[PDB]
């Protein structure tokens, strides 16, 4: 369960606007292969900048749409 | 002739006959792979 | 397990390539009438020219060279030049709109035999002073350029052996000579040999093959692990 920090909110994606797209910086240890690695994710529920997520799979990256 | 006879002029049995039919019986379409109007590219006739 | 039957082999490029033992391949262990040596011959291996020539620059990273296995020496697959081709991305990126793409096809036979087809492509260029919307070329000049390219390739490539011809194509010597003698006919943005392919080959000579490979590097595939 990799923990990621939301550094910015890209926007409200989806037709209904319930899902939002954010840029997530992984909160890994220093020297780890995932140190300072940023990915784009789709988040369900109210999320704000500086929030933290529990990513089950870090390989997948959300579409920029 | 195998095709002779009848109160109408007809072959009463399929005219496509086996390759192994004895002489006298091997009349008609001999060991035919197909019949009809071919209907398309004409295959090269003869053996393979 | 399928890999149990497999034996490993080394593919060796001729001596005019800096890296000799490029690539590795597998083959079924000769399980009887199905001899590995009989089935290996004729296999074509494609490699990037940059990998074959380490000293080569940026331009050689966009050319692929194919080699045909002419003989199986132990675990070494001694090969002969088969074809050379420019990569898809580089060739597609060379095309520009407001100019004419001029293509030439030249078929020559070397001293050993080895008929090959050359497939030269050229593009017209706007002049530095030019401000016209297009730089299209008159068909008279295109025919002249095609004629001169054909003569030069036939003259130069028909007096040399197969190994020298491959060296000329690999080291851009023939291409540079073409572009230098063809610019006076027509301002060329770029003259490039798109694809070389051997279409006909003489009867198989091993002595000439051994002479073409020089000193053959050994392979340790059959050695004890």
């Amino acid at each position: 369960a990799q923990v990621g920090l939301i550094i910015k909110v890209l926007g409200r994606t989806g037709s209904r606007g319930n899902v939002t797209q954010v840029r997530v910086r992984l909160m890994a240890e220093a020297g780890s292969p995932d140190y300072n690695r940023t990915i784009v994710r789709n988040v369900k529920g109210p999320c704000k900048e500086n929030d933290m997520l529990s990513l089950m799979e870090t390989e997948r990256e959300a579409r920029r749409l | 002739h195998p095709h002779g006879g009848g109160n109408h002029q007809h072959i009463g049995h399929p005219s496509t006959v086996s390759r192994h039919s004895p002489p006298g019986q091997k009349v008609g379409l001999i060991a035919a792979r197909r019949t009809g109007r071919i209907r398309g590219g004409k295959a090269v006739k003869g053996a393979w | 397990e399928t890999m149990a039957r497999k034996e490993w082999y080394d593919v060796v490029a001729p001596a005019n390539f800096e890296k000799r033992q490029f690539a590795k391949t597998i083959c079924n262990k000769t399980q009887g009438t199905r001899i590995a040596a009989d089935v290996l011959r004729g296999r074509v291996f494609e490699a990037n020219l940059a990998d074959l020539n380490q000293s080569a620059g940026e331009e050689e990273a966009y050319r692929k060279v194919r080699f045909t296995v002419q003989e199986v020496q132990g675990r070494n697959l001694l090969t002969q030049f088969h074809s050379m081709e420019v990569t898809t991305d580089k060739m597609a990126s060379l095309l520009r709109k407001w100019c004419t793409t001029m293509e030439t096809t030249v078929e020559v036979k070397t001293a050993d035999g080895y008929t090959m087809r050359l497939f030269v492509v050229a593009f017209t260029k706007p002049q530095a002073n030019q401000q016209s919307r297009n730089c299209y070329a008159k068909q008279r000049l295109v025919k002249w350029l095609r004629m001169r390219i054909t003569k030069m390739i036939k003259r130069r490539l028909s007096k040399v052996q197969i190994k020298e011809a491959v060296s000329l194509l690999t080291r851009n010597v023939l291409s540079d000579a073409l572009v230098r003698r063809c610019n006076p006919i027509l301002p060329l943005r770029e003259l490039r040999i798109r694809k070389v392919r051997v279409v006909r080959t003489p009867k198989f000579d091993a002595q000439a093959l051994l002479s073409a490979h020089g000193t053959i590097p050994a392979s340790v595939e059959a050695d004890q692990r």
Binding site: E59, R60 | - | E1, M3, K6, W8, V11, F22, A23, K24, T25, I26, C27, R43, V44, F45, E46, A47, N48, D51, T87, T88, D89, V220, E221, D223, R225
Partner: protein, 136 residues
């Protein structure tokens, strides 16, 4: 147990052919000649729905299976050759092309030359469909 007699850590190169259609994705690892194939895994071997055969996730799963088998075979580096269906049909690669290549890279496989090798006709036969095209 399987692999060439080479020093540990030296790169052994295969060729991965990534056929990314809009109906399926192929991850096919061969040697440099292309005659011998080490492992072929398709996107439809990882999903049960026909619509999910060409999904990026199916390509990712197929690539991971390829990486495991290539590890067993001794291959640790790969030249990639990606193609669309080509010919007279569409030249756009399928959804799983990027997914398969990224999954191979992330799974520890070394990546060599990348080339697009989709079939390009210099002049083609008639394309499927009428002169009115496919009407939807």
């Amino acid at each position: 147990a399987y692999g060439p007699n080479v020093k540990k850590g030296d790169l052994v190169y295969g060729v991965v052919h990534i056929f990314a259609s809009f109906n399926d994705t192929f991850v096919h690892v061969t040697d440099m000649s292309g005659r011998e194939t080490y492992v072929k895994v398709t996107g439809g071997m990882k999903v049960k729905a026909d619509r999910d055969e060409s999904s990026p996730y199916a390509a990712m799963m197929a690539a991971q299976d390829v990486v495991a088998r290539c590890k067993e075979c001794g291959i640790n580096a790969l030249h990639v050759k990606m193609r669309a269906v080509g010919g007279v049909r569409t030249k756009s690669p399928g959804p799983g092309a990027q997914a398969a290549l990224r999954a191979l890279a992330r799974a520890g496989m070394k990546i060599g030359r990348i080339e697009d090798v989709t079939p390009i006709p210099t002049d083609s036969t008639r394309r499927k469909g009428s002169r009115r095209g496919r009407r939807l």
